[PDB]
Amino acid sequence: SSQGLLGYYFSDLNFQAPMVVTSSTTGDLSIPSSELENIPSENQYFQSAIWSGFIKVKKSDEYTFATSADNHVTMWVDDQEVINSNKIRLEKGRLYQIKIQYQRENPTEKGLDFKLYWTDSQNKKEVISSDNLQLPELKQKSSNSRKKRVPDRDNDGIPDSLEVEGYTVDVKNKRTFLSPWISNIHEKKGLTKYKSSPEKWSTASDPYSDFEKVTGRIDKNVSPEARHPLVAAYPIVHVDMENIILSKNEDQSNTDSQTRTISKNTSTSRTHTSSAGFSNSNSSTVAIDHSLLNTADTARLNANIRYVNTGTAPIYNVLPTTSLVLGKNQTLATIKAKENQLSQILAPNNYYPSKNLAPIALNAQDDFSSTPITMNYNQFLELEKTKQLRLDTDQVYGNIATYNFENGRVRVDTGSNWSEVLPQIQETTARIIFNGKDLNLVERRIAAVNPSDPLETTKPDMTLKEALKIAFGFNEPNGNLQYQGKDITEFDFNFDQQTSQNIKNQLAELNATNIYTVLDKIKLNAKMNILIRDKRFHYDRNNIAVGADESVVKEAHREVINSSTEGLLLNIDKDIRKILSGYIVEIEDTEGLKEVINDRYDMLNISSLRQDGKTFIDFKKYNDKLPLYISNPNYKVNVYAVTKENTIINPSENGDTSTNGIKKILIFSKKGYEI
Ligand SMILES: [Ca+2]
Ligand SMILES: [Ca+2]
């Protein structure tokens, strides 16, 4: 189904303007006019065609060839003419390069009815079976047997003219047509316009060709958007820690004593470090939940983790090595996983192990040779004081599942490594980081011109508006670019120093003053670094959402579904719920004196997301599993939110553990008689 010959149909007489580039599984190289719907009938007359590929006999013999129009054809087997009706020998299990040309001046009908025949020695003629036909070797190199030799400079298969003018693909039966882009026909039909470098086998410089992507001849786990010739396909990996277990460690000086243990959940964001940076390292920051021995001791931690692949291509036989770090640069541990011994793939937008299996332990329960992770006394304090650890991760991703034109299958290829590709990718694409998803930093990379390197000239022009559409799924339902119903203007822009001077020089040249209104005209360059973030939120130096504007947070808590002396039951937006680290509840008597119910910095965890997706705030938790006692219907019940960034994680210098001084935000206030 994936094999057969490759065919170029031209509407002119000499293979100049190709109308269709497609493959046929058998010697039936016909295209019926009814599959030429997305070509005007002005073009459906083909004056010439070229086919190329290989034939493989399954039984040695003396074969004769012939076509449906021998008076219009010239056929070659191994650069040896055979048509212009004779005989030739073909040894078993050995491939033969075939090229067939066809020219008919002024066809009287649309499409092409053409068939390729061979006759064996027992004198049975036939349309050639599928199992005897194979595609050209459309790679950058040659395999031992398949030699590759209609301008196709990079040899991806898509002719040069089509890569430059534009082209689309239409999924016919199961077979794919590739045609020039015609404004009035495909604009109506909503088809995608494609452009790509006729000099780059792969225009984003990754492991899949511009032809492999747009025809489906590609690993099935590549993200839907990396199937675009201009959107790079690469893994991107960080480690997510989920919870942690600290312990008093076994001193060499009675091991039946009681247990001493701290077990808290954690949260891990993938980071970026700024004005965007040029770094391509993988890294994530872990925050340890802060709420409910002697100077010569040592403690040790265990934790559950999963790899996260937020890129656009799969990893198969290697997971990257990781450093668990404390403070600035004290590696406490290394985290490797055995090569070629993975229990599954790590797919894009996906975990390892998959969210349905259990996560990985750092010291597996069954594994004799896992290193105890250890801190000394002062390191432990550094950790209690920061409740933050870091996870740096290299880009060693291992081998690549590439496509094989000989058998038409996609297999892990031990000659392909990701380390041979990442550098070429990073050098020739603009990069966008966008957190519109879940306030999570997602990277993508789009082919862009480099106006100082001669090759990148032949690459397509890439506007900023287009990059957002094809790389992130922004669309414009009414001449208004948006991402899932949020207008583009709700996200801000940031750039590294160089990109920023570039874009500014561009606006000046367009005499434009506001970027949002000339996105379709801002161009991208290789090595550009663009950050893009939700305007509602405040971000730390790692570009992690750690707060919001008070008014944003108040409006968010305006929809109060219900309330009582046991709690409030609100409808808070998922994104907001993500940057609040707790709530304070107080009963304010009538003289303005305030009594705080859960008056402690480690007791603000009273929120919780009920099944239906609504939030509930538990007054009973730190009030003795009771409801609130309001001894006067005029007394007020106040409730505040604390954002992640205003949450304090230790007692103060002087030793205060109250919520006194915490920066709160009033989100609800009612009287006793209104509850
Ligand atoms: Ca080409
Ligand atoms: Ca190309």
UniProtKB/Swiss-Prot annotation:
Please list where the region (Domain 2, membrane insertion and heptamerization) is annotated.
234-428
The annotated consequence of F211S reads: Impaired translocation of LF
Description of post-translational modifications: Proteolytic activation by FURIN cleaves the protein in two parts, PA-20 and PA-63; the latter is the mature protein. The cleavage occurs at the cell surface and probably in the serum of infected animals as well; both native and cleaved PA are able to bind to the cell receptor. The release of PA-20 from the remaining receptor-bound PA-63 exposes the binding site for EF and LF, and promotes oligomerization and internalization of the protein.
Q: Where is this region: Domain 1, calcium-binding?
A: 1-233
What happens upon changing I515A? Loss of toxicity due to defective oligomerization
One GO cellular component term of this record is:
host cell cytosol
Binding positions for Ca(2+) 2? D154, D156, E163, S197, K200, D210
Q: Keyword annotations for this protein? A: Calcium, Cleavage on pair of basic residues, Host cell membrane, Host endosome, Host membrane, Membrane, Metal-binding, Plasmid, Secreted, Signal, Toxin, Transmembrane, Transmembrane beta strand, Virulence
Question: By its UniProt entry, which InterPro entries does this protein fall under?
Answer: Bacterial_exotoxin_B (IPR003896), Binary_toxB_3 (IPR035331), PA14/GLEYA (IPR037524), PA14_dom (IPR011658), PA_Ca-bd (IPR035088), PA_dom_4 (IPR027441), PA_heptamer_dom (IPR027439), PA_heptamer_dom_sf (IPR037149)
Gene3D superfamilies, alphabetized: 2.60.40.810, 3.10.20.110, Protective antigen, heptamerisation domain, Toxin - Anthrax Protective Antigen,domain 1
The effect of I305C is:
Loss of capability to undergo conformational changes that lead to pore formation and translocation
Q: Pfam families in the record, alphabetically?
A: Binary_toxB, Binary_toxB_2, Binary_toxB_3, PA14, PA_Ig-like
Biased composition (Polar residues) is annotated at 252-271
Q: Where does the record place the region Alpha-clamp?
A: 177-185
Name this protein carries in UniProt: Protective antigen
Species the sequence originates in: Bacillus anthracis
| Gene this protein is translated from | pagA
